[PDB]
Amino acid sequence: GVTVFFHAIISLHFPFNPDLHKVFIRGGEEFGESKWDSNICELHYTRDLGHDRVLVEGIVCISKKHLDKYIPYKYVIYNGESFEYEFIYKHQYVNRCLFIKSSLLGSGDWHQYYDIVYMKPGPRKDLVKGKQIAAALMLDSTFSILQTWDTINLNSFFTQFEQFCFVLQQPMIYEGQAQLWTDLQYREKEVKRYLWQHLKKHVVPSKLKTGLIVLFVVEKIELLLEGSLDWLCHLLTSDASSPDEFHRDLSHILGIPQSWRLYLVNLCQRCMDTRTYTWLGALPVLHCCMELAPRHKDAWRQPEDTWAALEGLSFSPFREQMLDTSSLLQFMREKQHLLSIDEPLFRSWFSLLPLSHLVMYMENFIEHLGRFPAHILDCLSGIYYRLPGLEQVLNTQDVQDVQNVQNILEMLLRLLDTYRDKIPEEALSPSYLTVCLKLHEAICSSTKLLKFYELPALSAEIVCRMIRLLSVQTVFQGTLAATKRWLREVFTKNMLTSSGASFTYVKE
């Protein structure tokens, strides 16, 4: 029927030997109609705690009846001096309550972790030590399954970890009837710090699979990768060559029904909120979990988060507040291979950068754009999403930022011209003409000076190249309209100083 594993923590209660003597479970007529008839089960040695401690393990299988109800259970020990009864320092006959959830039992096997052996030879010391010990021992035990690498091991691991966590989140205590912890007023940080360090130590020397298992453990125990989130980002950053290998590795683990997307969005959101840049390498796994929709041809209607493949991430704060972008581009250059194994990543990285560095981004990854010319169009789309900032930038006639916008447009022209013949006909769409129209509009509306004429002209030339690549007359008409508007605003007065000695504007 139902199989129950017992695991009982022994501590300085007595500085004893692995099996100086022996540990037992006794149970009422619920665990089985053997209520106090004998020690229903004895626990045998399989591993030693050392450092003030020992551990025995036992197994008993009793019929399935126990699903969906509470069991009374108690510990008794063999010591050569007596049979002894354990006791819990509870301020108040009493029971212990064990439980077996029907839903977590896929293997039909329940593991009863987190059981303590308290006997008469303060309590916080026992529970902090014991809880660190049990949680660490559960971590290594469950990781022992990953020694075996395929879907059956992965599912068993996640199930057994969920069984332990079911007992850890509600290791019920009884008073009339049993419910969530009161004997502890659950306190974890002292244990959780040790467990974060222990998980880190054990995982650090397939990495991606390790990182994903670590992230699952982290999110289930409500753990945070405390002030060192970057390390997990390293584990999730693939060294693959091209999509087939990366997707092959990921498929086994991610194919398991789990909330990988929520966990990875949380990871990236925290790595942004704490202002680190290694998370950029984990993005491909988030994209593999997201199950994105194709790059619909009318993309500019798409929101940036859905275009950037960052649904659920507040990227704009990270983009704006993060100052050391030079490290961001150095990291992107270091992990340029990731752009080959993930089409959307170019949009995410582009989206995550501030406006100024975008040109250095497009230059730094121009070879990728030559290998993947369709991405050139996403650059236009990205500038569209930047367009509000560029307006705020153009409205202030700062020579540096106007020159930056000019360099952005010159780069876009350089790309569209050099890669005119490589751009696939599939990704091409009239919608991109609209993007360039809007771009032109925003520049012309915002650009108020005559010397800045180069900026409108380049945007207009961009529209030309888009046309030449292919609402078309409409886009042309809007471009011409905006150009005439700009000329009107700039050329506020008549052409010449009609004295014939000068031109009203030298640049007209």
Side-chain angles (χ1 to χ4, degrees):
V2 164
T3 326
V4 297
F5 290 54
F6 293 115
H7 309 277
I9 300 180
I10 298 90
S11 266
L12 61 102
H13 310 141
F14 266 134
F16 277 359
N17 161 292
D19 257 356
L20 234 184
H21 299 287
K22 291 93 185 161
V23 183
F24 310 102
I25 283 255
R26 254 207 2 177
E29 48 80 73
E30 277 218 59
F31 200 66
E33 266 50 44
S34 158
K35 109 171 194 89
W36 319 145
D37 67 352
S38 99
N39 318 262
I40 209 151
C41 180
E42 178 172 29
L43 299 192
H44 312 335
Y45 220 90
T46 68
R47 162 56 101 160
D48 185 353
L49 273 40
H51 269 198
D52 320 326
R53 323 177 179 100
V54 294
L55 180 273
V56 282
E57 210 285 342
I59 306 295
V60 67
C61 95
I62 297 169
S63 32
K64 307 200 75 181
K65 59 235 171 176
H66 299 127
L67 307 195
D68 307 45
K69 53 164 155 119
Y70 269 134
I71 295 177
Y73 77 98
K74 317 249 82 166
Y75 278 90
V76 299
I77 50 187
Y78 173 75
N79 53 54
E81 204 184 330
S82 144
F83 293 167
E84 211 102 344
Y85 273 72
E86 271 67 5
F87 175 88
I88 329 301
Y89 310 112
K90 182 129 170 167
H91 290 322
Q92 51 203 149
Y93 218 98
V94 57
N95 339 302
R96 303 169 194 251
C97 314
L98 161 151
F99 185 90
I100 299 177
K101 199 180 192 179
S102 265
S103 69
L104 303 198
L105 281 203
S107 148
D109 204 271
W110 181 260
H111 288 185
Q112 189 67 7
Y113 272 113
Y114 257 29
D115 233 312
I116 313 279
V117 178
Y118 288 145
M119 63 278 194
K120 258 293 291 174
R124 47 96 34 72
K125 315 253 311 318
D126 288 59
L127 320 133
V128 184
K129 294 179 296 188
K131 287 165 72 51
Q132 271 179 4
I133 297 155
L137 286 171
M138 185 277 319
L139 291 178
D140 37 350
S141 149
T142 54
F143 269 61
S144 317
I145 310 163
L146 58 55
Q147 273 66 354
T148 42
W149 273 115
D150 86 86
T151 293
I152 172 66
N153 284 275
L154 282 208
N155 179 285
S156 45
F157 166 85
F158 295 134
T159 302
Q160 175 181 311
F161 186 84
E162 284 173 33
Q163 292 174 9
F164 162 70
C165 292
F166 177 87
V167 191
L168 177 146
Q169 290 158 16
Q170 49 272 332
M172 289 103 159
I173 72 278
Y174 171 95
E175 49 268 347
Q177 55 150 28
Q179 46 283 306
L180 278 39
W181 218 325
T182 203
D183 158 70
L184 177 70
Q185 310 116 67
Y186 202 154
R187 176 203 27 60
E188 330 92 46
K189 202 77 211 203
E190 294 78 314
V191 174
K192 286 195 180 184
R193 72 167 38 95
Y194 178 85
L195 292 173
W196 160 69
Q197 291 136 41
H198 186 88
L199 185 54
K200 200 163 184 280
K201 282 184 301 286
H202 175 263
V203 304
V204 299
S206 177
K207 30 182 208 70
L208 304 174
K209 283 170 167 239
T210 315
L212 285 163
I213 297 299
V214 170
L215 177 59
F216 175 81
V217 172
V218 163
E219 292 283 340
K220 279 280 176 178
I221 307 171
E222 302 99 56
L223 282 164
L224 279 172
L225 323 178
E226 314 299 5
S228 324
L229 306 133
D230 59 63
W231 117 73
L232 186 55
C233 296
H234 168 70
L235 292 165
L236 298 172
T237 317
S238 191
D239 54 318
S241 206
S242 76
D244 316 339
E245 310 96 45
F246 181 56
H247 293 308
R248 177 161 58 238
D249 312 348
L250 285 199
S251 62
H252 260 319
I253 183 154
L254 294 182
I256 305 171
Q258 282 299 352
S259 147
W260 296 120
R261 184 189 167 153
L262 179 59
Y263 297 160
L264 285 159
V265 76
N266 289 347
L267 178 68
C268 292
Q269 183 61 47
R270 274 202 55 67
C271 290
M272 289 194 304
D273 288 338
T274 36
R275 299 294 179 249
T276 165
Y277 35 91
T278 58
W279 72 282
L280 293 176
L283 276 174
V285 192
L286 176 54
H287 297 159
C288 194
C289 297
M290 273 178 162
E291 318 175 47
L292 304 156
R295 52 144 91 197
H296 295 67
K297 278 48 191 152
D298 221 24
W300 59 272
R301 298 184 186 289
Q302 296 168 349
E304 187 178 18
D305 70 69
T306 304
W307 169 81
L310 304 159
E311 307 96 48
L313 292 166
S314 86
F315 60 87
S316 210
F318 169 87
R319 153 167 65 194
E320 294 175 30
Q321 297 344 305
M322 192 68 166
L323 77 178
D324 187 36
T325 54
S326 98
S327 288
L328 212 61
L329 293 183
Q330 180 54 26
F331 182 87
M332 288 177 178
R333 188 204 312 290
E334 282 171 18
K335 318 306 189 181
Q336 61 184 336
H337 64 270
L338 297 180
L339 293 168
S340 295
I341 79 187
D342 197 35
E343 186 274 290
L345 195 71
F346 183 80
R347 298 182 267 138
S348 315
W349 282 7
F350 188 116
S351 148
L352 289 157
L353 287 169
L355 281 97
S356 326
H357 294 255
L358 296 179
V359 183
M360 200 194 334
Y361 180 80
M362 295 185 283
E363 299 185 350
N364 284 340
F365 306 111
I366 189 162
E367 307 91 29
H368 167 65
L369 290 176
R371 290 162 57 202
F372 300 71
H375 281 133
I376 298 167
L377 302 175
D378 301 333
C379 301
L380 296 166
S381 312
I383 292 305
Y384 171 72
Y385 298 106
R386 299 327 181 107
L387 207 64
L390 288 166
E391 292 191 0
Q392 208 302 283
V393 160
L394 290 177
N395 287 346
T396 177
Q397 294 89 14
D398 199 14
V399 302
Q400 309 148 54
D401 315 17
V402 298
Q403 189 62 46
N404 189 75
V405 184
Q406 176 170 335
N407 292 353
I408 290 170
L409 301 161
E410 288 183 327
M411 192 57 59
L412 289 166
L413 289 172
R414 191 171 75 145
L415 293 170
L416 292 172
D417 286 341
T418 59
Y419 304 112
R420 195 270 189 84
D421 51 32
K422 311 197 212 320
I423 286 159
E425 81 306 329
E426 218 194 10
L428 276 167
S429 324
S431 75
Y432 291 115
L433 292 156
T434 318
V435 162
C436 297
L437 177 58
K438 286 282 161 282
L439 172 61
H440 188 60
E441 290 189 312
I443 281 159
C444 291
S445 100
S446 87
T447 307
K448 302 312 200 186
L449 304 190
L450 180 63
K451 59 194 189 174
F452 296 160
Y453 70 99
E454 280 294 334
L455 290 178
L458 296 161
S459 58
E461 192 153 21
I462 290 169
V463 183
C464 101
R465 305 313 167 141
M466 283 298 317
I467 297 170
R468 296 189 84 90
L469 270 169
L470 319 168
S471 75
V472 178
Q473 193 72 7
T474 325
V475 168
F476 173 83
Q477 279 175 342
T479 309
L480 184 52
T483 316
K484 291 195 186 203
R485 197 182 298 222
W486 180 82
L487 288 157
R488 279 156 42 185
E489 281 42 1
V490 169
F491 299 142
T492 179
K493 41 177 157 278
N494 50 100
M495 187 105 164
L496 287 154
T497 278
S498 35
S499 326
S502 209
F503 270 82
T504 325
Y505 316 93
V506 193
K507 304 207 174 288
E508 177 153 8

